[PDB]
Amino acid sequence: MKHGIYYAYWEQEWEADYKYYIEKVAKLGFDILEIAASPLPFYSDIQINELKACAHGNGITLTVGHGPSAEQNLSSPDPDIRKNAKAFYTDLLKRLYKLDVHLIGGALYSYWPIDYTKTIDKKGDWERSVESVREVAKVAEACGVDFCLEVLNRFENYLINTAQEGVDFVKQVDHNNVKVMLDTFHMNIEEDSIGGAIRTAGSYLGHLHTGECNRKVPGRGRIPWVEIGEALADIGYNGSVVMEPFVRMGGTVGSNIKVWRDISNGADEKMLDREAQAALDFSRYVLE
Amino acid sequence: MKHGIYYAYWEQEWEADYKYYIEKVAKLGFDILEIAASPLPFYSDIQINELKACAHGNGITLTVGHGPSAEQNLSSPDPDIRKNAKAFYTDLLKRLYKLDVHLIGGALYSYWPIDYTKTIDKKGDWERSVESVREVAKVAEACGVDFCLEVLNRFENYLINTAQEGVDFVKQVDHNNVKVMLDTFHMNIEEDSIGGAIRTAGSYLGHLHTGECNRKVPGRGRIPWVEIGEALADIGYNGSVVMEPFVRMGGTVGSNIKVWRDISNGADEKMLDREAQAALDFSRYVLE
Amino acid sequence: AMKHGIYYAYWEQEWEADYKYYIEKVAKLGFDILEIAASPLPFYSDIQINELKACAHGNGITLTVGHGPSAEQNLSSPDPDIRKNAKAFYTDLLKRLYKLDVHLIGGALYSYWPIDYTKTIDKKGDWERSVESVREVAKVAEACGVDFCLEVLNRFENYLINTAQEGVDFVKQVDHNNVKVMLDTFHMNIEEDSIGGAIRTAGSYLGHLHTGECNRKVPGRGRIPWVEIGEALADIGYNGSVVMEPFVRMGGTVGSNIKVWRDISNGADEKMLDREAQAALDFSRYVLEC
Amino acid sequence: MKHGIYYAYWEQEWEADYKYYIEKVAKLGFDILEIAASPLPFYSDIQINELKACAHGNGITLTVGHGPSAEQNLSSPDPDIRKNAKAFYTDLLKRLYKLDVHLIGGALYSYWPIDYTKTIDKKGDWERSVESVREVAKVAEACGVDFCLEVLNRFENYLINTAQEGVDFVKQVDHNNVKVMLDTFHMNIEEDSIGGAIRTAGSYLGHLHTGECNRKVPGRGRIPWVEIGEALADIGYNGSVVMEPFVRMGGTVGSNIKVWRDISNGADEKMLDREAQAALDFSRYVLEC
Numbered sequence A, B: 001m002k003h004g005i006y007y008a009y010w011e012q013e014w015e016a017d018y019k020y021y022i023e024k025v026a027k028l029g030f031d032i033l034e035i036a037a038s039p040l041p042f043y044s045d046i047q048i049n050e051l052k053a054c055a056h057g058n059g060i061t062l063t064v065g066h067g068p069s070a071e072q073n074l075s076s077p078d079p080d081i082r083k084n085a086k087a088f089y090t091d092l093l094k095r096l097y098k099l100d101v102h103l104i105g106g107a108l109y110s111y112w113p114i115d116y117t118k119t120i121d122k123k124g125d126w127e128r129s130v131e132s133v134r135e136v137a138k139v140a141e142a143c144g145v146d147f148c149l150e151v152l153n154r155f156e157n158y159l160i161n162t163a164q165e166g167v168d169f170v171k172q173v174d175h176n177n178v179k180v181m182l183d184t185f186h187m188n189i190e191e192d193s194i195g196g197a198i199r200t201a202g203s204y205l206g207h208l209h210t211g212e213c214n215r216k217v218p219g220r221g222r223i224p225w226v227e228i229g230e231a232l233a234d235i236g237y238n239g240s241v242v243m244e245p246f247v248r249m250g251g252t253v254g255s256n257i258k259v260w261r262d263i264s265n266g267a268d269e270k271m272l273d274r275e276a277q278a279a280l281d282f283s284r285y286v287l288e
Numbered sequence C: 001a002m003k004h005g006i007y008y009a010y011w012e013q014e015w016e017a018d019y020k021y022y023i024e025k026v027a028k029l030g031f032d033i034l035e036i037a038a039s040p041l042p043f044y045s046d047i048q049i050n051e052l053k054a055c056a057h058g059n060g061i062t063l064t065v066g067h068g069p070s071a072e073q074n075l076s077s078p079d080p081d082i083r084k085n086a087k088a089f090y091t092d093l094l095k096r097l098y099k100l101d102v103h104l105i106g107g108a109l110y111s112y113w114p115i116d117y118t119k120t121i122d123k124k125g126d127w128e129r130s131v132e133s134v135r136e137v138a139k140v141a142e143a144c145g146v147d148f149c150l151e152v153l154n155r156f157e158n159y160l161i162n163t164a165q166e167g168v169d170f171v172k173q174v175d176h177n178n179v180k181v182m183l184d185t186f187h188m189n190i191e192e193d194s195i196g197g198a199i200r201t202a203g204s205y206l207g208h209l210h211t212g213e214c215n216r217k218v219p220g221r222g223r224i225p226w227v228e229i230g231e232a233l234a235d236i237g238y239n240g241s242v243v244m245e246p247f248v249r250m251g252g253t254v255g256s257n258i259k260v261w262r263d264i265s266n267g268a269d270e271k272m273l274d275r276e277a278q279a280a281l282d283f284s285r286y287v288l289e290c
Numbered sequence D: 001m002k003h004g005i006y007y008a009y010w011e012q013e014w015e016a017d018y019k020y021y022i023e024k025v026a027k028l029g030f031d032i033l034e035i036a037a038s039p040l041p042f043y044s045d046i047q048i049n050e051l052k053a054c055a056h057g058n059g060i061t062l063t064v065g066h067g068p069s070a071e072q073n074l075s076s077p078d079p080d081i082r083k084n085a086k087a088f089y090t091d092l093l094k095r096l097y098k099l100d101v102h103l104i105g106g107a108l109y110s111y112w113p114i115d116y117t118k119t120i121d122k123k124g125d126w127e128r129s130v131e132s133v134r135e136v137a138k139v140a141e142a143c144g145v146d147f148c149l150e151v152l153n154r155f156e157n158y159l160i161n162t163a164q165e166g167v168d169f170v171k172q173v174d175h176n177n178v179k180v181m182l183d184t185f186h187m188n189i190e191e192d193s194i195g196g197a198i199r200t201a202g203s204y205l206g207h208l209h210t211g212e213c214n215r216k217v218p219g220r221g222r223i224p225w226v227e228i229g230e231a232l233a234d235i236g237y238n239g240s241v242v243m244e245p246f247v248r249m250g251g252t253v254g255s256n257i258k259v260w261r262d263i264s265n266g267a268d269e270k271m272l273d274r275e276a277q278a279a280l281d282f283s284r285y286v287l288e289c
């Protein structure tokens, strides 16, 4: 099992010098660094090539996460937004190929975070979404990318909140390059059973995000890690496990994640490094 | 220990025929019926004695919960809003005295749900709210009412997300009729420890809400009920326990609570009644 | 879905008692089953058996039997005479169960209990002899309409079968339809890496289930992962019954064999014991099904 | 918080070349090695200093565990047995002071493992033990050693099975050098609450043994480690935490601990080293803070 961490653990915006973090997590011992997709459309082929060679240099595999904007909403009733959305993913997926990135994940069937003042049309958005995603999936297959649909709690998305819903959606899309993606922070709120949710995901599970109930690094909270290790083994899980902890207030990140107190408790970068590393040793130990 | 249930488990709006529910709930065996404060301001004085008479007749104690509107926001920087807020609560509290209810709870130091598209000024809102709630406390005291401030998850409020924050706020208010309030659904997201959160609240805990991780009735979910029961015993809790399950889509209730799937799985009124009653026997049994 | 019972010994300190009294009590508390100790059964005259049967039937109660065998009834003994005496004991007992209209017996039927550890242990050898003996006793049980359940116990009470995997291995070797694995939350709590895992491991072989908290209090207020147990029973499609086996009182052969060295009941009188068992029944039906 | 491990994790008898293990565990990263008291009386005065030399050298602190024989039973109704028991502990404890060991633990108030074949007189054994222990306590306060009374499950002892009984006995002894000692293996069986038991022990908690429900090294089993760490923080535990894993069949250890299946799953000494090391990282991570 490959273990990684989301660069955002150290940053407050959906961009950063990914080369800096590639070097950092290589030395902390991770196998993967997960980066936000939004700055990638602004990269020249020269920039793409050196990010790839840097990852290759430090032996880090790169995975991508993305919280779509309203403009990239594949489920939109607006046909122009859906058209712009597909063009965005078509370009993005092609860049992922140039980067030898074989996985992208997040609320890709919608946008994040949802603006709840709009009016929800779950039934309508769901049907439009399944159609849009199946299309994008052809481009994903061509670029060799696993398009992972993350199940989110109710406050962040209304389309897919439980693993069963995720499996329903993915089965309805019916394209091998579309997988279900689970996240322990999200399962903690919505699921009746954690091992149960993983087992329900089964062969469709393409990616796993980890964090404690309140998003601290994995291990000293209430998430049932041993139960998760068991269920992953039950489904013969063959994917990466990326920790996505958020412990700092401020910026677009603190605001979108809703960190309203200093959960890191004054950690400086070295302290943050120490804990991610301890949480990595924990995860390899307990989850495999 | 007194056990209750929030009338909203059967309804999709913040008001209903409370007399009907007093009768149902007395028949299911509950000690308490919790009702939404929303309609109480507009109750003729006859309606108040009728509701009050019904409760006494059926041996049911009434408690009140309230998600305040933006105009009732005691933390608002706008002085006219704070003035209205205070007028709202003084009138509501006098009515509660007439209705013979001694407890009100919710995000009373703020408003609910939070419109996150407005800028967040936590420190400023915090200082204002503490000062505002302290004034209201005087009236709550005159009316024989415990003013309980509920600790909520990050997605529903930004001022108080943990038992420690709630205690810091209440001690700062420094008035005997202002209490901390916890909710198992909210604790499940924010806390490092459930039992620890309860022990942190300690003497300040004046009310407790229950529900599974995903708001189903207590019992077959992942909430650590025994640990909650053991911590209530540790602190010597002398209050009540009200389950607040939300399993139905639709209306203001379904959208404020964000129920996007039929969690009840088709239950009709009779089936909701039985599940409520089974969770009551579980609750009395496990929480002691 | 499942039938729920309680072992009569929750109220008694010897491995026998007036079972009719307990059938009447548990029927009123709402149980489907009363599990009784086998020990006094070889001394029941035919009419005593019929009265016990009529009492259970008249009260809509189903009887199951538990048995901690004596060293003289050790089917795994290296002594050929003890094994012979053992088989005769079981044959006679199974026929009595047939007269009683009882279809399930469980416990350390492949050994004896409590095990005297001052004796040298020969696991490999005892295992082989046991498997052999069980096979032939199983044939008698089959003819009597009785499922022979082998209970997986913790290390301090037996050395042959301490985990669900060992229980499944042993039961597969026996290779007889009416011979089954039986799990008990108190024993799994000690030996198993995973509770749900153990149950899923037992799978289609699981024929009986005993319940009790970690220190043997009635189910519900302790640390046993009940919810997890319910999911795993649903995963394996468990059809059988679930019998809580609380032991909260000091004294007698029961207190001594179960090693209750403090008053875990906290001074409960009979009526108090009755109330807890009933709440624990309500809890078990609510949490364990679906 | 110092972390250790019991040497018997690698051995099948209650003795071994403790130097080999001090060097092993120092390399593995442990702060402490716990050794069995059994072979200690047979040590000559020279043998003591060597062992103590080998320990300070490697920067390892030594704690001692001891499951008493019937003849060292401080709770015995036989005055001659109680007499020899105090003699045994007085001698053993003087040796411990010459080793600069400051803590000993186990069913020191009785014997282990007990023969349940005999007649048990809990009330009587309890009263004799309380007095005997309080006496031995004087000698312990003298050799600068903490006399730790470990709470055991019903199958291994009948005098003290819960933290509450442990605290009651210790408070009865009423002596600064006698502490309560908990063990996750035993608490897992007897306690209503793990964190509750630790909080009950409170300031009386003098030592802690860890292990999974079935005695594997800490980490991948069902023990509530986080709850344990939060509870140690609640009581401000300063003490040592010693893992006591037992995964091997055979010998007196295999028989006393009752390992009747190869729980190690064919691990060799190198494999056992790795798991203990990983469990150590887990324990320092989860248990602290």
Ligand SMILES: O=C(CO)[C@H](O)[C@H](O)[C@H](O)CO
Residues within 6 Å of the ligand: A036, A065, A066, A067, A105, A106, A107, A112, A150, A156, A183, A209, A244
């Ligand atoms: O868990 C998440 C949001 O709460 C998802 O992984 C988002 O796609 C990610 O955080 C966006 O950066």
Ligand SMILES: O=C(CO)[C@H](O)[C@H](O)[C@H](O)CO
Residues within 6 Å of the ligand: B036, B065, B066, B067, B105, B106, B107, B112, B150, B152, B156, B183, B209, B244
């Ligand atoms: O838990 C709650 C909202 O999440 C609070 O109790 C609210 O005040 C209540 O649900 C509003 O009706």
Ligand SMILES: O=C(CO)[C@H](O)[C@H](O)[C@H](O)CO
Residues within 6 Å of the ligand: C037, C066, C067, C068, C106, C107, C108, C113, C151, C157, C184, C210, C245
């Ligand atoms: O769990 C058990 C003993 O520990 C078994 O069920 C015994 O056979 C039973 O209690 C004996 O009556």
Ligand SMILES: O=C(CO)[C@H](O)[C@H](O)[C@H](O)CO
Residues within 6 Å of the ligand: D036, D065, D066, D067, D105, D106, D107, D112, D150, D156, D183, D209, D244
């Ligand atoms: O846990 C123990 C016995 O189960 C105690 O620590 C014993 O004293 C120790 O194992 C003796 O070697």
Ligand SMILES: [Mn+2]
Residues within 6 Å of the ligand: A150, A183, A209, A244
């Ligand atoms: Mn995520």
Ligand SMILES: [Mn+2]
Residues within 6 Å of the ligand: B150, B183, B209, B244
């Ligand atoms: Mn609430």
Ligand SMILES: [Mn+2]
Residues within 6 Å of the ligand: C151, C184, C210, C245
């Ligand atoms: Mn049993």
Ligand SMILES: [Mn+2]
Residues within 6 Å of the ligand: D150, D183, D209, D244
């Ligand atoms: Mn120990």
